[PDB]
Amino acid sequence: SAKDERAREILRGFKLNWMNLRDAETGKILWQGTEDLSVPGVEHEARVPKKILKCKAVSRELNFSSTEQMEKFRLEQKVYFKGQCLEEWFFEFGFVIPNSTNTWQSLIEAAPESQMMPASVLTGNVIIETKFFDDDLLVSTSRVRLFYV
Ligand SMILES: *C/C=C(\C)CC/C=C(\C)CCC=C(C)C
């Protein structure tokens, strides 16, 4: 109940300003999203360029503002393909200063994958469920359906 109240307070002060996917090697922006993907209760959509799938290393840039302080801001992202969990990502940011705006890049450094699922198969069939936490406090759960265009 106090937990519920604190979570809603954080969420009220929180905005995802933008998300970019970048080519980590060149810094080139491959996709820019400006919808607040952190808002719960709606299915958001992202139309990402199919060329993403052949990019050797993709950094995820999130820029977010928070009126509230957070001790351990972090994300859990579960990627579903046709209802079934394909992969899981966990990204910790850490301590967030009250009234701050922060640019956050995340990279999972791994071997590029030469064998991928077709864009035509992925598109519209991928949902990313993101849980926004401060430590163990769940602030928000959003869903984004991916199209590869
Ligand atoms: C290369 C990364 C891909 C295709 C997944 C990108 C993620 C999204 C688009 C949605 C991210 C959602 C939040 C940050 C809430």
3-class DSSP string for the chain: CHHHHHHHHHHHHEEEEEEEEEECCCCCEEEEECCCCCCCCCEEEEEECHHHHHCCCEEEEEEEEECCCEEEEEEEEEEEECCEEEEEEEEEEEEECCCEEEEEEECCCCCCCCCCCCHHHHCCCEEEEEEEEECCEEEEEEEEEEEEC
What is the pairing mode between strands 70-81 and 126-134? antiparallel
d(CA 87, CA 43): 19
> Is 21 in contact with 6 (CB distance < 8 Å)?
no
Experimental technique for the deposited model: X-ray
Residue nearest to atom 9 of ligand 1 (CA): 46
Atom of ligand 1 nearest to the CA of 21: 1
DSSP β-bridge partners for residue 126:
81, 146
Atom of ligand 1 nearest to the CA of 132: 15
Distance 7 CA to ligand 1 centre (A): 22
CA 86, 147, 34, 140 dihedral sign is negative
Distance 71 CA to ligand 1 centre (A): 23
The identity of residue 30, as a single letter, is L
For residue 99, which of 14, 8, 40, 28 has the smallest C-alpha distance? 14
- Using CB distances shorter than 6 Å, the residues near ligand 1 are 19, 21, 37-38, 46, 48, 52, 58, 62, 128, 130, 142, 144, 146
Look up residue 19 and give its two tokens. 């998300």
37: exposed, middle or buried (C-beta count within 10 Å: 0-12, 13-18, 19+)? buried
CATH number for region 1-149 = 2.70.50.40
**Final resolution, Å:** 2.1
d(CA 41, CA 109): 32
